């Protein structure tokens, strides 16, 4: 009866009969509680749904009787993208809930960002805003979903691995016990699965800023520093904080128009006794050679600062910044993949006096809240 609440990037439905509880049985929607009636991969209309397994309502009745608050957590980015009308999705949800026959609270992530599984925004909303202030025991709760990162063929008729691991990673981020729909409703044996190679729980603020520690970030005399690394991974921030703040001239090629004005800019800075930093995407030998030649012509050293971030680390950082930094320029996946395809590690043979390695590390001076968010998986 309480009904729908609309927030900027979240919809919440609370059915008649919902009660706050200290334990929750939460569920994905698409491919977990429902599937297409049509038997197609994608629904042909808002009415193209059926309950996934006939075992489902009995299990839900049993959970409700044991005092579990029933909740749905669903990503519906089609709403934010303008492809799926919110008011049509709302109707579909009410129809599904009527068929399931038990009171549910539903939370819908309409956009990318904090609320989009696997990020735990919807859980935090449930706990902080939508459970009448009752603390929820995560250990006594459960999340059930089909985006579980399962390997192909976990059952007759599925030569296709799970498209996503977002449901399993949501549970991991929150600390919730997790099960697939088949393990949960049908008591099938656990299916084999894979986690992402990069685990953001492993990202430290520890260790040296750069290697070798015996080297110095700055030179007293003119030089050209060439920064190498994936975009959106913190290169420019590091350069701003450590070099530009020390008076290095930020020479940006993308905005100088042509090679000629760039080289001229570089040369004028050097002639003035200044140090120069190139903060661009310089993934391969030919990209970097231009700047090395400029240094050589000017008779100044060229050093490389090689930022260690991997593609998945960089993409993680990008998403984090999208979620937390109003000034962040979102780096597209195409830019990331193009960089990786072109990447050749810097070597001294290119003409560098030395190469410093800049380990991928958590930034200092993120507040505690942001650090907790940083360690969450943010893509399934
Ligand atoms: Cl989802
Ligand atoms: Cl979605
Ligand atoms: Cl688990
Ligand atoms: Cl200077
Ligand atoms: Mg699903």
């Amino acid at each position: 009866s309480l009904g729908w609440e609309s927030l900027k990037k979240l919809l919440v439905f609370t059915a008649s009969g919902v009660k706050p509880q200290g334990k929750v049985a939460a569920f994905d929607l698409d491919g977990t509680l429902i599937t297409t009636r049509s038997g197609k991969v994608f629904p042909t209309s808002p009415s193209d749904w059926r309950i996934l397994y006939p075992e489902i309502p009995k299990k839900l009745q049993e959970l409700a009787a044991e005092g579990y608050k029933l909740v749905i957590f669903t990503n519906q980015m089609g709403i934010g993208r303008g492809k799926l009308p919110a008011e049509v999705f709302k109707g579909k949800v009410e129809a599904v809930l009527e068929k399931l026959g038990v009171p549910f609270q539903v939370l819908v992530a309409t956009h990318a960002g904090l609320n989009r599984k696997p990020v735990s925004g919807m859980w935090d909303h449930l706990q902080e805003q939508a459970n009448e202030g009752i603390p929820i025991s995560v250990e006594d709760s459960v999340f059930v979903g089909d985006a579980a990162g399962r390997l192909a063929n976990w059952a007759p008729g599925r030569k296709k691995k799970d498209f996503s691991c977002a449901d399993r990673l949501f549970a991991l981020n929150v600390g919730l016990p997790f099960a697939t729909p088949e393990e949960f409703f049908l008591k099938w044996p656990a299916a084999r699965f894979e986690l992402p190679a990069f685990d953001p729980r492993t990202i430290s603020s520890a260790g040296p800023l750069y290697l070798p520690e015996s080297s110095s970030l700055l030179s007293p005399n003119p030089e050209v520093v060439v920064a190498v690394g994936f975009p959106g991974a913190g290169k420019s921030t590091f350069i701003q904080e450590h070099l530009v703040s020390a008076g290095y001239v930020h020479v940006n090629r993308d905005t100088l128009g042509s090679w000629q004005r760039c080289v001229s800019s570089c040369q004028a800075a050097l002639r003035q006794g200044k140090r120069v930093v190139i903060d661009n995407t310089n993934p391969d030998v030919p990209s970097r050679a231009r700047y090395i030649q400029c240094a050589k012509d000017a008779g100044v050293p060229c050093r490389c600062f090689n930022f260690c971030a991997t593609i998945e680390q960089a993409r993680h950082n990008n998403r984090f910044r999208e979620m937390t930094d109003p000034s962040h320029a979102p780096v597209s996946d195409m830019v990331m993949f193009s960089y990786r395809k072109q990447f050749e590690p810097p070597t001294l043979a290119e003409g560098f006096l030395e190469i410093l390695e800049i380990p991928f590390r958590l930034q200092e001076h993120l507040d505690p809240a942001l650090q907790r968010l940083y360690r969450q998986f943010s893509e399934g």
Side-chain angles (χ1 to χ4, degrees), residues 28-30 32 73-77 109 116-117 122 143 146-147 164 166-167:
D28 176 55
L29 178 63
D30 295 332
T32 295
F73 289 118
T74 184
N75 288 349
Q76 298 293 335
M77 202 160 67
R116 182 172 173 78
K117 301 183 290 180
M122 292 192 279
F143 184 57
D146 67 307
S164 175
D167 290 325

Side-chain angles (χ1 to χ4, degrees), residues 241-252:
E241 296 183 355
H242 298 287
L243 300 178
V244 176
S245 74
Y248 277 59
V249 180
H250 202 267
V251 169
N252 187 336

Side-chain angles (χ1 to χ4, degrees), residues 24-27 60-61 63-64 68-72 102-105:
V24 164
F27 299 87
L60 298 176
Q61 285 282 337
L63 294 158
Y68 289 90
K69 185 183 204 187
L70 306 181
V71 175
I72 289 166
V102 289
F104 264 94
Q105 192 168 50

Side-chain angles (χ1 to χ4, degrees), residues 225-229 235-237 239-240 244 249-252 254 277-282 291 307:
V225 167
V226 176
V228 174
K235 268 208 327 205
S236 67
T237 296
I239 286 172
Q240 178 56 53
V244 176
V249 180
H250 202 267
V251 169
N252 187 336
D254 298 3
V277 55
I278 312 301
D279 175 14
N280 286 135
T281 276
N282 304 304
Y291 298 105
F307 294 73

Side-chain angles (χ1 to χ4, degrees), residues 220 246-249 269 272-275:
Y248 277 59
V249 180
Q272 289 158 23
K274 296 184 186 176
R275 286 84 40 95

Side-chain angles (χ1 to χ4, degrees), residues 115-159 161-193 195-252 254-255 257-259 262-295 297-340 342-354:
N115 292 328
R116 182 172 173 78
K117 301 183 290 180
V119 186
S120 72
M122 292 192 279
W123 184 263
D124 300 327
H125 187 89
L126 166 59
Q127 173 69 93
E128 302 171 4
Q129 305 291 327
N131 202 45
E132 306 200 6
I134 301 292
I136 302 161
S137 173
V138 303
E139 297 91 348
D140 293 318
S141 296
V142 61
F143 184 57
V144 182
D146 67 307
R150 287 170 286 191
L151 275 47
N153 298 317
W154 50 277
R158 338 247 186 175
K159 310 191 218 309
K161 71 198 316 187
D162 283 337
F163 177 77
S164 175
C165 193
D167 290 325
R168 184 183 304 273
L169 296 179
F170 177 82
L172 199 45
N173 285 334
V174 175
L176 288 163
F178 175 79
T180 66
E182 297 76 24
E183 295 154 13
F184 193 73
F185 296 116
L186 312 184
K187 301 278 200 47
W188 290 13
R192 292 187 72 191
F193 64 95
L195 300 188
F198 170 57
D199 189 336
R201 295 172 298 175
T202 80
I203 295 306
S204 190
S205 198
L209 189 59
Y210 62 88
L211 304 162
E213 299 185 67
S214 59
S215 293
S216 294
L217 282 181
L218 308 174
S219 173
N221 312 302
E223 69 160 349
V224 177
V225 167
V226 176
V228 174
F230 281 89
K235 268 208 327 205
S236 67
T237 296
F238 179 106
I239 286 172
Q240 178 56 53
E241 296 183 355
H242 298 287
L243 300 178
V244 176
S245 74
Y248 277 59
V249 180
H250 202 267
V251 169
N252 187 336
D254 298 3
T255 306
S258 75
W259 182 227
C262 174
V263 149
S264 294
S265 161
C266 192
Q267 290 172 338
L270 296 174
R271 195 178 306 119
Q272 289 158 23
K274 296 184 186 176
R275 286 84 40 95
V276 172
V277 55
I278 312 301
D279 175 14
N280 286 135
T281 276
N282 304 304
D284 55 29
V285 175
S287 295
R288 298 183 294 261
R290 323 271 249 135
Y291 298 105
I292 289 166
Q293 187 63 42
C294 177
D297 286 355
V300 309
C302 189
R303 298 189 292 145
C304 175
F305 284 14
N306 197 24
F307 294 73
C308 311
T310 64
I311 187 167
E312 287 313 322
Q313 295 175 327
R315 292 181 72 253
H316 177 89
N317 195 63
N318 182 60
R319 287 188 297 272
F320 177 82
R321 286 171 186 203
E322 286 180 358
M323 289 183 291
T324 64
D325 183 355
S327 302
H328 180 68
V331 180
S332 71
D333 286 332
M334 270 194 308
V335 163
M336 297 294 187
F337 284 91
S338 168
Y339 176 95
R340 166 172 83 167
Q342 302 170 357
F343 183 77
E344 308 185 89
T347 66
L348 296 170
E350 303 186 35
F352 295 114
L353 173 63
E354 77 174 335

